[PDB]
Every structure is written in C-alpha cells, then in structure tokens.
Design a protein around this ligand. Structure first.
Ligand SMILES: Cn1nccc1C(=O)NCc1ccc(-c2nc(-c3cccs3)no2)s1
Length: 111
C-alpha cells in the first residue's frame, strides 16, 4: 500500500469529489436490475465507483497513485461506453475527472 501521506492526499481528493453535484451518479455501485439496465454487466466487466475507491484507499489496496488514477478513469470510461461518450452522466464524469486530476497533480512524492 502507498505511504500514509499519499493515502491522505488521495482520500482528500476523493472527499472533495464526493462533495460535487457531478459526482452523484458515481457515489455508489451500479445495481443493473434496480436501474432496469439488466445488460450492464454484459457491457461493463470492471464496474467502479467512488465508494469502492475510497474503501480501497482505506484498505491500503493501492500500490501506487497511478492505480488510483486508473480506477477513476475506469469509472468514467465505463460510463462513456455504456451511457455514451456525450451522455449527461458521462459529462458529469468528465467534470469530476477534471476535479480529481487537479487534486492528484499535487500528489506528494515518496521522498
Ligand atoms: C448506469 N450508470 N453508469 C454510471 C452511473 C450510472 C447510474 O445510473 N447510477 C445511478 C445514478 C444516481 C444519480 C444519477 C444522476 N443524477 C443526475 C443528475 C442530478 C442533477 C442534475 S443531473 N444525473 O444522473 S445516476
């Protein structure tokens, strides 16, 4: 797992993103049948959401900050594939992706 200071930085980035209206579609895992999109898991083989990223950070399940960035990008790209590249949800994902990248560019180095 990444050292404490990087873990803290990523956690603060995630909390900042969670505060945003544009995060609302991404706060929790998708339940396809509950949303009457039963083909979701046929299209999306690696579901991802903000709660999972935060829990993984708390579980020290990331080895590098780039893995966090990869999971965030995967979440947004899942929306791009399933809802469409210009769908409302996808553009909200692009917005919070920009916010998260702003917070992650400032990630402190190991040494
Ligand atoms: C199928 N899927 N892929 C990624 C995410 C999803 C999905 O459906 N998650 C459940 C949702 C919760 C809130 C959503 C939403 N809130 C809004 C708006 C609020 C205010 C202005 S827009 N738009 O969507 S979606």
């Amino acid at each position: 797992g990444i050292p404490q200071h990087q873990q803290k930085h990523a956690l603060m980035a995630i909390k900042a993103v969670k505060r945003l209206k544009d995060a609302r579609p991404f706060l929790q895992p998708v339940d396809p049948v509950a949303l009457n999109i039963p083909l979701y898991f046929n299209f999306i083989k690696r579901p991802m959401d903000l709660q999972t990223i935060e829990r993984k950070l708390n579980a020290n399940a990331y080895e590098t900050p780039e893995q966090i960035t990869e999971d965030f990008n995967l979440m947004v790209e899942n929306s791009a594939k399933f809802n469409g590249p210009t769908a409302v949800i996808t553009q909200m994902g692009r917005n919070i992706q920009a916010a998260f990248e702003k917070h992650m560019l400032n990630m402190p180095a190991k040494d």
